[PDB]
Structures are given as structure tokens and as C-alpha cells.
């Protein structure tokens, strides 16, 4: 194609992205930055403030999922992994809206999400982070980087990579419009392990890449290399996920008490 159709694609995708993902990057940035009206996240920066915070958010999950009885490094990890599960569900509903996705072989639909969801989650996490911490509870609280950096032993070394990633990624100044298509392009990757019919996936992705190229031209006319930088980010995100999987599977042997939601167990099962 062809301008009006690539623009109607970009628009379809943004409209779905807003229906699928509760806290947009625009609203997260408004929060992190100061503004809105609608005024000002609770901060977690020590044990006392963590416990004050947990009392604001606990109604959110049924009683067992609070894991009261676990040391805090593990509750925080359990809380992220459960928020990640909620992410997979939003991404799945997002993916279903990508023209052509639901007409793919169902087994391929599963493979695209299996291999896609972690890279997407890293991209979403970046919209919630600045140099100083991370928005939590759908933007209602803010956990400082230093607090997370002070968790015991294994855990306290492991957020800092998320932070350095986000800082470089957020320096691209992508808007939700850009992110909607960037995300759709990651999902429709034709080179995931075990795909049955690669061609119809590449064919959709080709349309998506043309919509993304047009979107960045229009929305970032002052950055001619931005498309290329974004494709490079997709490679970075693969390598980051690789690292993460390999780490999980060496840490989890030490950290009895660490448990994966079964949705994530199926995801990690043959995942590289």
C-alpha cells in the first residue's frame, strides 16, 4: 500500500491499544512527571511505606494472592509475576485485534504469543519507569529504584537492568501511537520457533512495518533514523529475554518459595 490504509491501520491499532491497556504511556508520563489533576502516587521507599502501600492495594486480589507470609523480596517478585500474567491477558486481547491475526493457524497464534509476550512486557515496563522508580498499581503508587536496589542478595541486583533499558528506550520519545504498532510488529514475527505457516505472518508483519515506517515519518519527522533504532531495540529485547529466562531457571533452584503462575509455566516451558 498506500497512505490512507496504513494510516487506518495505525488508527485501528491505537484505538485497540487504548481498549486493551489500562494505563497508557501518556497518562503514566503525566503521573511520573507531575501534572495531572488527579493528584499524586503513594510512594514505597522502605518497609513502613511498603506496608502502608500494601493496605491500599490488597483488595485487588483474592486473599491467597497477597502472600502475607512470605518475606518481602518474594512478595514483590510474586506481585510482579502476577502483574505480568495480567499483562499477557491484555496483550492477548490486543493481539486478537491485529487484522489477520485471528485467521492464522491457532497453533501459530499460540506460538506468536508464547514468544512475544516477554518482549512486550519489557516495552510496557519502560513506559512506567523513570530514572528514580516505577509506577505500580496502575499508576496509583511509585516504587523507588533505590528501594528495589536494596532487596536481598539475588533480587536487589536485578532491577537495575530494567532501569537502564528503560532509560535508553524512553530516550526515543515514543508515543502510544508509535508503541501500538511497534508492539503489533513484535507479535507478528515470522521467525519464532515452530511456526507452521510463516508466510501469512510475514505478510501481516510487512503491512505493520510499512505502517510503522509511515507513523514515525509523520510523528517524528526530525529523527530520520528512528525506524532503524526501533528495529535495533527489537533485537535488544530478544537478548534481554534470553538473559532473563536463563537467569530465572538458575535462580529458581535457590529460591524455593518462588512460584510461577501456571500461565507463565506454560509460557516458559519450551522458551529460549
Amino acid at each position: 500500500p498506500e497512505s490512507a490504509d496504513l494510516r487506518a491501520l495505525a488508527k485501528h491499532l491505537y484505538d485497540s491499544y487504548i481498549k486493551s491497556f489500562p494505563l497508557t504511556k501518556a497518562k503514566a508520563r503525566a503521573i511520573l512527571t507531575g501534572k495531572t489533576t488527579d493528584k499524586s502516587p503513594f510512594v514505597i521507599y522502605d518497609m513502613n511505606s511498603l506496608m502502608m502501600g500494601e493496605d491500599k492495594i490488597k483488595f485487588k486480589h483474592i486473599t491467597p494472592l497477597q502472600e502475607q507470609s512470605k518475606e518481602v523480596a518474594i512478595r514483590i517478585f510474586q506481585g510482579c509475576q502476577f502483574r505480568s500474567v495480567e499483562a499477557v491477558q491484555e496483550i492477548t486481547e490486543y493481539a486478537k485485534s491485529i487484522p489477520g491475526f485471528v485467521n492464522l493457524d491457532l497453533n501459530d497464534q499460540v506460538t506468536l504469543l508464547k514468544y512475544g509476550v516477554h518482549e512486550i512486557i519489557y516495552t510496557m515496563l519502560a513506559s512506567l519507569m523513570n530514572k528514580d522508580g516505577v509506577l505500580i498499581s496502575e499508576g496509583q503508587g511509585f516504587m523507588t529504584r533505590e528501594f528495589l536496589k536494596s532487596l536481598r542478595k539475588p533480587f536487589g541486583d536485578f532491577m537495575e537492568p530494567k532501569f537502564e533499558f528503560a532509560v535508553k528506550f524512553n530516550a526515543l520519545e515514543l508515543d502510544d501511537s508509535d508503541l501500538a504498532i511497534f508492539i503489533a510488529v513484535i507479535i507478528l514475527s515470522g521467525d519464532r520457533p515452530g511456526l507452521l505457516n510463516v508466510k501469512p505472518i510475514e505478510d501481516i508483519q510487512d503491512n505493520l512495518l510499512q505502517a510503522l515506517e509511515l507513523q514515525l515519518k509523520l510523528n517524528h519527522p526530525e529523527s530520520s533514523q528512528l525506524f532503524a533504532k526501533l528495529l535495533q531495540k527489537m533485537t535488544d529485547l530478544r537478548q534481554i529475554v534470553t538473559e532473563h529466562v536463563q537467569l530465572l531457571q538458575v535462580i529458581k533452584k535457590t529460591e524455593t518459595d518462588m512460584s510461577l503462575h501456571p500461565l507463565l509455566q506454560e509460557i516458559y516451558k519450551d522458551l529460549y
Binding site: 492477548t92 486481547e93 485471528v102 497453533n107 499460540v110 504469543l113 506454560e266 509460557i267 516451558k269
Partner: peptide, 17 residues
Amino acid sequence: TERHKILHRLLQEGSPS
């Protein structure tokens, strides 16, 4: 269906309820 029972159910036409 797999193997990826949950994911397969999420992929069902529908919409969470």
C-alpha cells in the same frame, strides 16, 4: 490445544468475562 491450555482458552473468540 497443547500444552498451552490457558493461553489457548485466552485465544478463544469471546472476550474475558
